[PDB]
Amino acid sequence: DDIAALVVDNGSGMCKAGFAGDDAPRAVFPSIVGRPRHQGVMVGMGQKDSYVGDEAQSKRGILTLKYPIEHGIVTNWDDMEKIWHHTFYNELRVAPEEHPVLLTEAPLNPKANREKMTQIMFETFNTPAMYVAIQAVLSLYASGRTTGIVMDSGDGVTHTVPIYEGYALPHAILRLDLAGRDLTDYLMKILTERGYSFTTTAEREIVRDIKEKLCYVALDFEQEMATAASSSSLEKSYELPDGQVITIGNERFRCPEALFQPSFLGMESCGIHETTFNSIMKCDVDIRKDLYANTVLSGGTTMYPGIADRMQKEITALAPSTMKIKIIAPPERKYSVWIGGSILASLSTFQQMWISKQEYDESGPSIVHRKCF
Amino acid sequence: SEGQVRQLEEQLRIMDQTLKALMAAEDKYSQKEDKYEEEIKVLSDKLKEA
Amino acid sequence: AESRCREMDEQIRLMDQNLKCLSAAEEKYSQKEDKYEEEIKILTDKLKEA
Amino acid sequence: AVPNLFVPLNTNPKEVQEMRNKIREQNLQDIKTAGPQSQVLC
């Protein structure tokens, strides 16, 4: 049937894009923009003002990496336009005039973000129709159940939202500004104690690779401190790009522990387990036992090994003992939002809900608050 | 060296296909097993009430 | 080509262990479901008993 | 109008349940597919 729509997930860290009705996205690439900083001397090599996405990752030695999205908010709109142009033309190779697009963004965001996103996707790319959805609702689509509380942790922001029988309670939505970038900065801070110093924006990606490869969530924090103090069995060795060898050891389970105790970063807010429990208790009495049995994890930050056991144990400790707590973590939970987007984008009954181009022309960019959510 | 590289990687793709099939069957019978697991509970409650 | 072959052999024999590591627990519940249903039958009899 | 302004009513959940299974079928069967080709390309 006719032409298929586009599904684009713009998290704070990495951008994902593909065609609707597909199982997995075609294009997955980091959301960075790089510009050179040194002198250029070789005459005739050609000029290149900006490096977008993956191309900036390979030549990151001579660039200053900059992130267009910060804490789930688009700060520099020009770099977002560059990223979207690169996604549409170099990664998917499709004309945007033929396809509708579905976008994702955080629960609690400023109004101007949505208004400017609608204005950009209509004015420049001339898309015929577009729509904005909350990422965690798409996670609940990806899971395939009608009832549950879903906690999504990205590179920019963490948020919990409960949904019961297709109805979402707006007052129980919790947003927390503790994500993967803060953990990367904390790892950069605690790697100083052993003598390794990373300062420039190029080494931030090295620290991120170290965090993705050699970090795990401890089941019991003090017992792991005792074990790491007693022996050297917890140390692991990593090789830098220049050939030096580093050995982390104790800091493997101290970086991801900071999610559960945000006082390590100086933040006053509670941990993710207490945030989920408080968001559950904000709901009504009758739906709480259903929310205990359908907790869904989403986002890349929850890909630490051992996060599920720690979360289940903490929520079991906080909740009354007479009920059962199960945490449903699919193995492909990184792309869950995008999968949900596909499931939403090609429903038969969803086709009446696109924001039409004529409606935008006759209403201005303010139409996105009346529709969407 | 080209020869054994080309053989080995398609062998790998066959074997990951097998892994996917068995993982899918596991997900089937586990999602069956939990509803059967609370079926027995409902049965026991009926018993105790009677 | 040779250095890529080394890595590819590592990957294939790691997954070769992993596949039947997954197979074992599947056929464990394949033999488990028998008692899990045969106990439910006796439980249903004890239900109608009361 | 304010409780369910954002969604249309009287929709069967079985349609969504069918579509999720249809998408999972491609993952199980490992289908080769290409994207939609443009008319201007044709």
Binding site: R26, P331 | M23 | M15 | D30, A34
Partner: peptide
């Protein structure tokens, strides 16, 4: 690591195969 291995399997097979097939078709047509 088993969850990590399954995520690696999904990302290596399903994400990459579709992109490679689309690249092949686009290259031949271009």
């Amino acid at each position: 690591d088993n969850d990590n291995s399954s995520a690696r399997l999904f990302e290596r097979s399903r994400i990459k195969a579709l992109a490679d097939e689309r690249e092949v078709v686009q290259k031949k047509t271009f």
